[PDB]
Amino acid sequence: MVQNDFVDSYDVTMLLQDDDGKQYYEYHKGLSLSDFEVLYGNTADEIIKLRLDKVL
């Protein structure tokens, strides 16, 4: 995504696992380190991947 539209505040990409073991990816951008701490604390599940990126 272009660095003129994806760009406000940090990006958080996370990947977790489900009952079929087939996994679920999502990204969460235009937020901050405190909002990353929400997703990290909300997880309570099979963690597979996690990323954060202070945009631009």
Add this chain to the structure above:
Amino acid sequence: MVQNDFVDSYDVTMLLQDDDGKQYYEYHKGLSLSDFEVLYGNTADEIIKLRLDKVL
């Protein structure tokens, strides 16, 4: 045996910015989610990216 080639526990890969205005890495294989909280809490600098990845 400790991480020979990623192979132990959680891969953690952070990136923070120096006063020179460029990034430096914090690669840490063989961690856990509690050790990630230590790394994220103790490194304390201008964080630009991070990753966590459960072992292969």
